[PDB]
């Protein structure tokens, strides 16, 4: 298992001194599509946004998704075996 | 061997027509040539003067006080341009005329503003260009409206700057 906590990468919102914009930006969807060539250089604003999305979303799967599933998995099970029981002690 | 622009202060003004004594019959008495060479001298102020009549209406060397009259004739107004940058969108609107877009042509317009390495240019399979900037001496925001119009109707651009490679 991995062995430290999962940081998130240009987590603040705000405009970069040396710039004065904002952090983070998409990529243009036809970069995407294709990414980088030799002669295609890449910006600050997508190299920091691709890194912040898939750290942000490792969290959201890591951090929230699991223990609300087996929340609910378990509260499942509960409400099934109330509702049976209470038709077993009828 | 000789210059062909003809405009320049008159060397050794002075001492000529001081050269026009006729026979050093004055020369040496102190008391008429300082009265010709306070005349004199007077036209040296007015003929140096007269080049930079000249040479300094030239869109080159012109001062915003009156570059604004050389773009007005052109009707490429100040907007909010300051004085360095007001020359480059003058010279560039201008050779706009004569041109055609291409790769070669284009790579031409962007080596005067930012020396012989500062600029590089990607090309894409679908309509895709990209232009690099690596001693960019000017901010770009404002001279960007430009740097659009000498490009093909149909042109898909990427604009990133930075300092040196």
């Known amino acids: 298992k991995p062995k430290d906590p999962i940081y998130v990468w240009a ?9 004065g914009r904002p952090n983070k930006s998409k990529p243009i969807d036809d970069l995407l599509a294709k990414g980088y060539d030799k002669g295609q250089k890449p910006a600050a604003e997508e190299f920091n946004y691709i890194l912040n999305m898939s750290s942000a979303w490792v969290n959201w799967i890591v951090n929230e998704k699991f223990p609300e599933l087996e929340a609910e998995i378990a509260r499942l099970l509960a409400e099934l075996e109330n509702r049976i029981n209470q ?3 009828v | 061997l000789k210059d062909v622009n003809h405009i320049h202060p008159l060397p050794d003004f002075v001492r000529g027509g001081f050269d026009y004594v006729p026979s050093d019959i004055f020369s040496g008495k102190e008391n008429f040539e300082q009265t010709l060479r306070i005349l004199l001298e ?12 000249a040479e300094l209406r030239t869109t080159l060397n012109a001062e915003d006080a009156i570059l604004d009259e050389i773009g007005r004739q052109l ?5 909010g341009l300051n004085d360095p940058e007001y020359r480059a969108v003058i010279m560039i609107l201008t050779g706009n005329n004569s041109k055609s877009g291409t790769r070669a042509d284009i790579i031409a317009t962007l080596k005067q ?18 232009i690099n900037i690596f001693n960019t001496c000017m901010e770009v925001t404002d ?22 490679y």
């Open chain 1, 11 to 19: 987590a603040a919102d705000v405009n970069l001194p040396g710039t």
């Open chain 1, 87 to 89: 038709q077993l002690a």
């Open chain 2, 42 to 53: 007077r036209l040296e102020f007015i003929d140096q003067k007269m080049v930079e009549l």
């Open chain 2, 75 to 79: 009707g490429i107004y100040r907007n």
């Open chain 2, 113 to 130: 503003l930012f020396g012989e390495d500062g600029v590089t240019t990607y090309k894409g399979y679908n309509y895709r260009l990209d």
């Open chain 2, 143 to 164: 001279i960007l409206p430009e740097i659009i119009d000498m490009l093909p109707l149909v042109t898909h651009l990427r604009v990133v700057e930075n300092q040196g």
